[PDB]
Each structure stands twice: as C-alpha cells, then as structure tokens.
Coordinates of N, CA and C in Angstrom, one line a residue:
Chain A
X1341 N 77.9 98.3 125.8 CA 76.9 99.3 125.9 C 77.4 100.5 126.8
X1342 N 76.9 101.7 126.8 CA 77.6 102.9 127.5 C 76.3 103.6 128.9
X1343 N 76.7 103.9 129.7 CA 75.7 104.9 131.0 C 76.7 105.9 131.3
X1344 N 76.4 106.5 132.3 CA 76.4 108.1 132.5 C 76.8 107.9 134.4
X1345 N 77.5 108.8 134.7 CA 77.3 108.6 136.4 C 76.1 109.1 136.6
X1346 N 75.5 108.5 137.7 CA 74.1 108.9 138.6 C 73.9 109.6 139.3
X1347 N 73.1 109.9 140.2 CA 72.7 111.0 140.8 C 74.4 111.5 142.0
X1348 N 75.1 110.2 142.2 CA 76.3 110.6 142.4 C 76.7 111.2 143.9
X1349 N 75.8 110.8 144.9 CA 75.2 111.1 146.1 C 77.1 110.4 146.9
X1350 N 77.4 109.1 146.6 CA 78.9 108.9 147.2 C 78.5 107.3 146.3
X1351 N 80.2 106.9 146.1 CA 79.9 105.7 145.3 C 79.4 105.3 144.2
X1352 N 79.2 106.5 143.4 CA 78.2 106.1 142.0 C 78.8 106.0 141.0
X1353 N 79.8 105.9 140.2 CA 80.5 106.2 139.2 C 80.3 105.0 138.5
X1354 N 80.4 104.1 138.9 CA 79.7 102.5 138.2 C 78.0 102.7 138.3
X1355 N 77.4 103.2 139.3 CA 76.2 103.2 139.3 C 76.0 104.1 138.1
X1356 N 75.0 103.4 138.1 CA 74.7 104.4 136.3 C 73.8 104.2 135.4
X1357 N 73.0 105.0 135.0 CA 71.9 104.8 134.1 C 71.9 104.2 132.7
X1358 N 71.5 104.7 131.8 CA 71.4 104.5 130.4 C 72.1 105.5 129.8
X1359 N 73.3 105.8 129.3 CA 73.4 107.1 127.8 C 73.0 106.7 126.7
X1360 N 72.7 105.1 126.9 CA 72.8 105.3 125.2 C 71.5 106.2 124.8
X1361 N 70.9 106.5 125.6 CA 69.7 107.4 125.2 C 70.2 108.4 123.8
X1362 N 71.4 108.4 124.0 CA 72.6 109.4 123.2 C 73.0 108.7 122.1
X1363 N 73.4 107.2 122.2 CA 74.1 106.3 121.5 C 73.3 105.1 120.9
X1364 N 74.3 104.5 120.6 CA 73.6 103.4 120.0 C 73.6 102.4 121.1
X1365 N 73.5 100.9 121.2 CA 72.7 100.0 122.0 C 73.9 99.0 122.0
X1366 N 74.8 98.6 120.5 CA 75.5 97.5 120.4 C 76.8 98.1 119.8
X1367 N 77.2 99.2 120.3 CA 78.4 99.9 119.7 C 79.4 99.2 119.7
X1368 N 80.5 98.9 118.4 CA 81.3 97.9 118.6 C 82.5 98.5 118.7
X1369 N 83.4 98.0 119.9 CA 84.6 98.5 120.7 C 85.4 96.7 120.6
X1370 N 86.8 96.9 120.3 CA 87.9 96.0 120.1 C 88.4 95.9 121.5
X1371 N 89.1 94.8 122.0 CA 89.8 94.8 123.1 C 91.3 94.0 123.1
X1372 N 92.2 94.9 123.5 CA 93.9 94.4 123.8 C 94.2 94.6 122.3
X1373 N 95.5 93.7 121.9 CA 95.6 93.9 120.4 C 95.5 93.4 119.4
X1374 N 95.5 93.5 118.5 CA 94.6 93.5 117.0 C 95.4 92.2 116.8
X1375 N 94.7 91.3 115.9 CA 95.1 89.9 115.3 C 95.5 90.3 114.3
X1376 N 96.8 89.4 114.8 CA 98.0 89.0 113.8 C 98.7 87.7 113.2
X1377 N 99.2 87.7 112.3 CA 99.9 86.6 111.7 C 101.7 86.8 111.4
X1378 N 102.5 86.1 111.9 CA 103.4 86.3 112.0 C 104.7 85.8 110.9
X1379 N 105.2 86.3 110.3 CA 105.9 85.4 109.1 C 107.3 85.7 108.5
X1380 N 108.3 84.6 108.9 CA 109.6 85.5 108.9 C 109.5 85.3 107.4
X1381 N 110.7 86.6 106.7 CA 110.5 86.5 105.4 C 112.0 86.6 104.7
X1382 N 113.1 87.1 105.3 CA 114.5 87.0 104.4 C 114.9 85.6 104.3
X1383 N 114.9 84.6 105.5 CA 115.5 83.6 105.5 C 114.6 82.5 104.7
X1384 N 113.5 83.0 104.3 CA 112.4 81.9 103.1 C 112.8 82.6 101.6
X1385 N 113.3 83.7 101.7 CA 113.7 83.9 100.4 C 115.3 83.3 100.0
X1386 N 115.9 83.5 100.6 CA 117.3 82.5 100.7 C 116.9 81.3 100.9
X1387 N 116.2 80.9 101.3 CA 115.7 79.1 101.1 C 115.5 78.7 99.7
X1388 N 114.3 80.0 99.3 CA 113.6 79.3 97.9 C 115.2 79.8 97.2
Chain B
X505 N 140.0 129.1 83.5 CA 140.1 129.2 85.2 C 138.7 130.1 85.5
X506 N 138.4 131.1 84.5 CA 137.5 131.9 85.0 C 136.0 131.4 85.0
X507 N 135.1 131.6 86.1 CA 133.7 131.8 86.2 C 132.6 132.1 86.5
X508 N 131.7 132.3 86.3 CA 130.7 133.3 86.8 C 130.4 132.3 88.4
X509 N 129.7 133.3 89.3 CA 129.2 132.6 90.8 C 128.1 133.6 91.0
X510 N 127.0 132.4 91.2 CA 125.8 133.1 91.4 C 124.7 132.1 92.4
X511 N 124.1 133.3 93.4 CA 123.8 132.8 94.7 C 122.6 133.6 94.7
X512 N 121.5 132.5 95.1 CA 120.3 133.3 95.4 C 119.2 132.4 96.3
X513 N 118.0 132.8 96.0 CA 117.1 131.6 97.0 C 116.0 131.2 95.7
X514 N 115.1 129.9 96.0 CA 114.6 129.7 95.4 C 113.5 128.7 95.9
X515 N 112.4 128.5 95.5 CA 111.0 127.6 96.0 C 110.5 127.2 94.6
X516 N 111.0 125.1 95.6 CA 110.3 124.1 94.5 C 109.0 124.3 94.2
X517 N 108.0 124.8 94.8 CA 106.4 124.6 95.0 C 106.4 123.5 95.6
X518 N 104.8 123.7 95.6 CA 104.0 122.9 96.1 C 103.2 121.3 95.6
X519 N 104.3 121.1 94.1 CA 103.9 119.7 93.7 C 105.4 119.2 93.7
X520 N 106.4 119.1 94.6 CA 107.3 118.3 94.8 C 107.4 117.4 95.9
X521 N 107.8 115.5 95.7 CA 107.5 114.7 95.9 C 109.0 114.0 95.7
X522 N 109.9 114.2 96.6 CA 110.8 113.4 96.4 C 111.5 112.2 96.4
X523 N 110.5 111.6 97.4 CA 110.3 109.6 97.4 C 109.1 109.1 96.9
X524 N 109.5 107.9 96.9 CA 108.2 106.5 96.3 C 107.7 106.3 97.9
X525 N 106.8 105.8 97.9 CA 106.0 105.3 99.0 C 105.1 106.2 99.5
X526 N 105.3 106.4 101.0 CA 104.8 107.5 101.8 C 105.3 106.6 103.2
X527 N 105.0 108.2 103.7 CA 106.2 107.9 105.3 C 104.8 108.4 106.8
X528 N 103.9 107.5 106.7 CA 103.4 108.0 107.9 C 102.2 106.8 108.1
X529 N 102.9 106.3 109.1 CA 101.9 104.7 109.1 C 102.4 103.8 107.9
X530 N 103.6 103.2 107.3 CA 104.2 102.6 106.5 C 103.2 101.1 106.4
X531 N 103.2 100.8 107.1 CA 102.6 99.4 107.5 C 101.2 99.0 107.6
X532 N 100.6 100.4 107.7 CA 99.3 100.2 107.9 C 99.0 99.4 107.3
X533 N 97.4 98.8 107.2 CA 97.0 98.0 106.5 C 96.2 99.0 105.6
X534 N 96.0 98.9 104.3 CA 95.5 99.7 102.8 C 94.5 100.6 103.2
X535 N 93.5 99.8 104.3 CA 91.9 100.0 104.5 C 91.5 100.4 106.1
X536 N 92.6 99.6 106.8 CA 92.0 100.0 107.9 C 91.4 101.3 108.5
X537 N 90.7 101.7 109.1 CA 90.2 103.2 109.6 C 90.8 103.2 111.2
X538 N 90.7 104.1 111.8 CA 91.2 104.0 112.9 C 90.0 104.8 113.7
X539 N 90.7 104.6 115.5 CA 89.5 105.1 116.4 C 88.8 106.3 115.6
X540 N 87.2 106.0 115.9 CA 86.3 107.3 115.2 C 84.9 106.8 115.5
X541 N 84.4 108.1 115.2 CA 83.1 107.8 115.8 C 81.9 108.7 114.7
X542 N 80.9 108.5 114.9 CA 80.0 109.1 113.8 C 78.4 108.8 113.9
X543 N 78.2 109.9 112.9 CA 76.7 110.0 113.1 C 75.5 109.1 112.8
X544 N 74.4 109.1 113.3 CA 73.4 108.3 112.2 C 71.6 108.6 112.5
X545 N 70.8 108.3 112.0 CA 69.6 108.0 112.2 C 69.1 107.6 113.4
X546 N 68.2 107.2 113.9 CA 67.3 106.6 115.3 C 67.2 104.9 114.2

C-alpha cells in the first residue's frame, strides 16, 4: 500500500497518511529478482 | 581493360531489414510487460 510524508514538523518521512486516496489499496509490486529456471543446454544436446 | 566508374550516394528507405530476429531485449520473455503504471475507475 502507498502514504504521503506528513505534516513533516522533524522525523516524518515514515510518518505518513493515506495516498492511496490517489491509488489503488492492493497495488501489486515484485520484490528482488524474477523466478527462474535454470537449464544447461549444449552439453544435453551432445548427450542426446 | 577499359571501364566505366561511377560514384554517387544513395538511400535504401525506410522498409529495409537486414537480419532475422530483433536486437533489443533478445531474451525477453514473448509477453512480459515491464515497469508501468496506469489508469482506472473508483
């Protein structure tokens, strides 16, 4: 979910309201990197 | 021994395609979309 800095008086940058007033509620964001499958492929062709 | 020589400039256009494939994200996956964001309803 996404907020906004706050009134921002010292320390607020985590402190934070609501944006999604702006956005959506369950916005979907990925994290680190993408799933993989790994598969050597010259040396299975010289096999087969 | 003799022959004519002749020198000038010239433009392929604009529908020339000199390889198979394409060269920019080779690997991508067919479908994937990448970072983006977009509009919608309430």
């Amino acid at each position: 979910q996404a907020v906004k800095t706050t009134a921002a008086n010292g320390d607020q940058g985590n402190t934070t309201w609501q944006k999604d007033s702006t956005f959506a509620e369950r916005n979907e964001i990925g994290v680190g990197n993408n799933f993989a499958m790994e598969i050597n492929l010259n040396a299975n062709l010289w096999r087969n | 021994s003799t022959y004519f020589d002749i020198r000038g400039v010239l433009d392929r256009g604009p529908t020339f395609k000199p390889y198979s494939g394409t060269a920019y994200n080779a690997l991508a996956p067919k479908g994937a979309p990448n970072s983006c964001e977009w509009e919608q309803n309430e």
